[PDB]
Symmetry: C11
């Protein structure tokens, strides 16, 4: 299965997994502090991932950056 | 399964999942505020995705932007 | 399964799903307002997609544009 | 399955599906008007597709154009 | 499965399907008039395709032209 | 979804010969092509080798090759 | 399955595996000292990997660096 | 399965099929006259192919030429 | 099949350490390479992560990386 | 399965098949004379191939030459 | 299944197969004299290969050379 790479560019970045299935809700929020890297797959339990906070993200489609408020 | 990357370029962007099967309707709308990123797969329950609002979108076919 | 990307270039673009199987008819019409994007798969129920109205379309074969009546 | 993209360049374009199996006959003709785009797969029921009238066609092998009589 | 694209460059082009199996014969001939395009797969029933008449053909291996 | 070969006859009477798959090897079918005709033929349950006799332009996944007649 | 390469650029880099399943928690943390390389797969037990500390990382999507 | 293309560059080229399995012997020799092309797969019965005589050969790995005896 | 890594020892005493697949994570084998030896090692039913300790040149599908000793 | 192409560059080149399985031994040696080409798969019976003598060899990893 | 190519650059090169499974030991050592080439797969019995002595080695990841003591 595909995965996403998230590098936090500020403290308190949240990487949130959304449930697979007929229902959609957040099942887990991993907090990353500045400079930490998370490499996360899609899985039986996770079919969408939301990133909140300033982060550098890599997927198979290229680079994208999230920006916080 | 494939996925789409959606970065909101303004507040209040909606990423809407349409149901897989003989019946087509919206089943979830995820609200993204400015700068938030959602990476969302097609799934057993979602066979089309609609993006409403200003966003930068990446798919296997390249970049497209909603307005 | 493959998917198509449709970005509406005017209001009232109509993305039409045609039934898979021995019979052929439309089963769903999804209307897009200008600037909305729909990313839609081929599925168990949909084996052909028709686009009516001005739109920018991406598929695995490249870019094509529909033009309205 | 593979799919074809067909964009009508004049009114009255016919995209014709031919039956899969031991017998070969037309089972459906989708009429497209000028500027409409149809993205159609090969399927359990459709093993060959015929295009009549002026159209721009994309497949995995590239672009080809049909011309009307 | 693979497919072939055939564009007829004159009237009366024939695209002929040969049967899959221990027996080999033509089972269908599709007539194309000038400008018409046929996109045809290999299938449970068709394991070879013959093109007769002037046509522009694309396959995965590139382009080829038949001549009447 | 097996591989296939494209054969364009460059003279009349090109002979495309299918050989039997299996412990035994002989031809089971010969398809003659007139000049300018194109045959697109797969390997299959029954054909595991294809021989071309006569002048022809041939394409496969490995590129172009040309047969030359007797 | 895919894998990640992590080279520690300082002492005490932590490579942490998060559990696959309905629940998400850390199940192992491997400590790397400066200059050690760990090549780690995603697995039945590990569906997310976190890197804490200064490291050079390669995945299929390219190079990224974590910072202490 | 993979296949080889062999074009005979002189009369009497032999394309020899070696048996798959614990024993190894020649089960068939196909004689090619000058200019003939043989396109032959590896199969249930053939796991190695020997070419004797002058020939131009294409495989997935590129071109190679056999030389006369 | 599974991916593999190539390791070339650039000094004596390089250790290539296999970590167990499964719920438990521990070292199960450590192969010691002397200078100039090469090891080409798969991921397997029993090994889901590999650690290299000591100066070595390493190739994987993602490219070259070099480990360094203390 | 993958295959290798071997062209003999001198008489008496041997292409040797090593048995697949718990035991490793030579089960067949194919003698190639100068200019002959052998194209040989890995199989149920053969999991390694040794070339002895002067030969030009092609595999998916490119060209290599053995030397007498 | 992947394979490696090993060409001996000196006499007495050893290509060693290490057992697959919970236990790890040498099950076979193939000696190569100068100029011999061995092309060897990973297999049910062999999950790691060690090369000792001066050799030129090709894998999917490119070229590497072992050096003798
Ligand atoms: N529960 C939803 C989560 C989801 C995935 N992709 C989506 C796209 C849009 C909205 C929701 C989703 C599903 O598994 O289908
Ligand atoms: N329920 C429809 C949703 C859909 C997917 N792709 C479409 C294309 C057009 C119209 C509807 C759709 C389906 O699963 O088939
Ligand atoms: N019901 C038809 C729809 C279709 C798909 N591709 C086509 C091409 C031409 C005509 C109809 C179609 C089918 O599933 O086969
Ligand atoms: N009924 C035929 C339709 C067809 C597909 N490809 C063809 C090529 C030539 C003639 C007919 C065909 C089949 O399924 O096999
Ligand atoms: N009935 C033959 C048709 C065929 C396919 N490819 C060929 C090549 C040569 C001759 C005949 C054929 C078969 O299925 O095998
Ligand atoms: N009957 C043989 C035909 C064949 C295929 N490839 C070959 C190469 C050499 C000689 C014969 C063949 C087989 O199926 O195996
Ligand atoms: N337990 C989660 C771990 C996980 C994987 N990817 C994630 C993305 C975000 C949050 C958690 C996760 C799972 O297997 O699904
Ligand atoms: N009967 C042998 C033929 C063979 C294939 N590849 C080889 C390499 C070397 C020697 C013999 C072979 C086998 O099937 O395994
Ligand atoms: N026992 C762990 C080993 C492992 C693989 N990848 C990891 C990443 C981080 C920590 C441990 C691991 C597993 O099989 O999952
Ligand atoms: N019988 C051994 C042969 C072998 C293949 N690759 C090797 C590498 C090294 C030593 C022996 C081998 C096996 O099947 O595993
Ligand atoms: N017996 C071990 C051999 C092995 C493969 N890759 C390794 C990496 C490191 C240490 C040992 C190994 C196994 O099959 O898993």
């Amino acid at each position: 299965s595909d995965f996403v790479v998230i590098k936090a560019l500020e403290d308190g970045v949240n990487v949130i997994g959304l449930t697979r299935g007929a229902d959609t809700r957040f099942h887990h929020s991993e907090k990353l502090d500045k400079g930490e890297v998370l490499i996360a797959q899609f899985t039986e339990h996770t079919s969408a991932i939301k990133v909140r906070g300033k982060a550098y993200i890599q997927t198979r489609h290229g680079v994208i950056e999230s920006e916080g408020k």
